[PDB]
Design brief:
This protein is mostly helical. It is built from 27 helices and no strands. The structure holds calcium ion (CA) (3 copies). One calcium ion binds next to helix 13.
């Protein structure tokens, strides 16, 4: 319009407008309390109404970044709570937002929420809109890049669970499974978008486009490349907007994209009917997770247009990015079975083949044989999966994570321990989420998740950079990250950490911790073990681990548990030291 804030309020409605802003403030200022953020939301919302009534009013012409940003700077506690973030205020837009974004904490160390059915069901009956708002808040301050519109959708879902389950006889039995299920979908989502924002920030839009072209051509093989391109442009803008903190424009731009998809479903896909009858937030989610359409019946083989054809360099030279998109599009729509990362490497390889072969005397002789060279890039992944799935089948989740701890602590011992523990834990879960699946689906499953988790490792590592190898693997290429990490081996350069008793002492507090935090503490100890005794043998750790559990199980049952750990602890230390020589 004439007034960006006005347009947003009109298109989105007050409800979603307030949600999205609550989120914005929650992701930028992750340590502020909910009550204060609600005040800020209402203020901005009142201003928004003024501008809708009167697009000419003072300030209404300013971008959301300017307006929202002018609000952060008016926060009295800003420097007290966030230090150098206050300095962002001394700057102009766009640098001011670039600055604010750069202080978003990807690991806030906020307390793990332990949901209590009573208190939650009380809060819900008491005030449903506020309940919803606090959920938006608690997730947004922990996931500062969470896809804002999807977060609205989850908040709705969350609420629907409470509406249903607080009526029931056993509140807890009804809802606890339901929020544990949803909570896993949310954590995945978080990661999925964090990889989107990391891509654009570290490798440019171009990298995100390529991802999308792959993803959508798989989903919509029936669509002409013209359409997929419009879809990708629109979907990329949506993400760029969310990633830069313009949540209202992200929300609006996404709803527009869903309307367009439903209006043209005849030239996009036959599997959208049920999606396109749903309410606004639910409609977009449904599209994003839609079933892949069938592949057109008689398609020409790839070799025809990308290897046997005699004008390939000519066409490539004259539209490099379109031609590579085209390839990706055509290859992608033929292979829904493939992982999006594999598809992208094939594109990256194919690209490298063209760049090299097109400078030679006889380009065709060179590029003719390219799909034999790509066949290899599909087989390489299939080895790891099989081996790692066997290792998973053998050990089960927990034991499997402990192998990964060992492998990765040897690979990258400089990395912080909490990072190693979190990442190895998530890497292990991949066994549960994938190996159980139909043998053929295994690699695509694991390749996608690994992509998500390895991204988390890079983002955590990028802040306190301490390992040249992680840095090399994280920054060299987005597509080859998984292979880069796989290929790392332990480094004999690494001087082992000096012994530190405090790392191996366990306190009676341990028996109070829930299973997950129990394993964390043990898995923390394991990491520290390999940092200090990095050449320690698989067989030796069996007994050391065996003896930690024998020790832990030995004291949590004892008459005076405090008295137990006092004497028995030092036993472990002395024992383990001797064992590891
Ligand atoms: Ca932290
Ligand atoms: Ca904007
Ligand atoms: Ca619109």
């Amino acid at each position: 319009h004439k007034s960006e804030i006005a347009h947003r309020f009109k298109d989105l409605g007050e409800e979603h407008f307030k949600g999205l802003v609550l989120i914005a403030f929650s992701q930028y200022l992750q340590q502020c309390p909910f009550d204060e953020h609600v005040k800020l939301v209402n203020e901005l919302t009142e201003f928004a109404k003024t501008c809708v009534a009167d697009e000419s009013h003072a300030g209404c012409e300013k971008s959301l970044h300017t307006l929202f940003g002018d609000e952060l700077c008016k926060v009295a506690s800003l420097r007290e709570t966030y230090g150098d973030m206050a300095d962002c205020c001394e700057k102009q837009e766009p640098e001011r937002n670039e600055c604010f974004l750069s202080h978003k904490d990807d690991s806030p160390d906020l307390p793990k929420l332990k949901p209590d059915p009573n208190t939650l069901c009380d809060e819900f009956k008491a005030d449903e809109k506020k309940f919803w708002g606090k959920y938006l808040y608690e997730i947004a301050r922990r996931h500062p890049y969470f896809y804002a519109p999807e977060l609205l959708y989850y908040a709705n879902k969350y609420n629907g669970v409470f509406q249903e389950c607080c009526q029931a006889e056993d509140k807890g039995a009804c809802l606890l499974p339901k929020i544990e299920t949803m909570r896993e979908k949310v954590l995945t989502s978080s990661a999925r978008q964090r990889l989107r924002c990391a891509s654009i920030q570290k490798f440019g839009e171009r990298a995100l486009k390529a991802w999308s072209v792959a993803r959508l051509s798989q989903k919509f093989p029936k669509a002409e490349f013209v359409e997929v391109t419009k879809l990708v442009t629109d979907l990329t803008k949506v993400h760029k907007e969310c990633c830069h903190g313009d949540l209202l424009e992200c929300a609006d731009d996404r709803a527009d994209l869903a309307k367009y998809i439903c209006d043209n479903q005849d030239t996009i896909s036959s599997k959208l009917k049920e999606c396109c009858d749903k309410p606004l937030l639910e409609k977009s989610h449904c599209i994003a997770e839609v079933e892949k359409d069938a592949i057109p019946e008689n398609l020409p083989p790839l070799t025809a247009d990308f290897a046997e054809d005699k004008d390939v360099c000519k066409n490539y030279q004259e539209a490099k990015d379109a031609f590579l998109g085209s390839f990706l599009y055509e290859y992608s729509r033929r292979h829904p079975e493939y992982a999006v990362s594999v598809l992208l490497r094939l594109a990256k390889e194919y690209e490298a083949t063209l760049e090299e072969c097109c400078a030679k005397d006889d380009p065709h002789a060179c590029y003719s044989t390219v799909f034999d060279k790509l066949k290899h890039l599909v087989d390489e992944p299939q080895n790891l999966i099989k081996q790692n799935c066997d290792q998973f089948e053998k050990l089960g989740e927990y034991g499997f994570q402990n192998a990964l701890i060992v492998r990765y602590t040897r690979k990258v011992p400089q990395v912080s321990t909490p990072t190693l523990v979190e990442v190895s834990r998530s890497l292990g879960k991949v066994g549960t989420r994938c190996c159980t699946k139909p043998e053929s689906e295994r690699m695509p499953c694991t390749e996608d998740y690994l992509s998500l988790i390895l991204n988390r490792l890079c983002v955590l590592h990028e802040k306190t950079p301490v390992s040249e190898k992680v840095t090399k693997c994280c920054t060299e290429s987005l597509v080859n990250r998984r292979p880069c990490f796989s290929a790392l081996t332990p480094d004999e350069t690494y001087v082992p950490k000096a012994f530190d008793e405090k790392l191996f002492t366990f306190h009676a507090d341990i028996c109070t911790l829930p299973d997950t935090e129990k394993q964390i503490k043990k898995q923390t100890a394991l990491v520290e073990l390999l940092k200090h005794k990095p050449k320690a043998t698989e067989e030796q750790l069996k007994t050391v681990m065996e003896n930690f559990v024998a020790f832990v199980d030995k004291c949590c049952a004892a008459d005076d548990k405090e008295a137990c750990f006092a004497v028995e602890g030092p036993k472990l230390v002395v024992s383990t030291q001797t064992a590891l020589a």
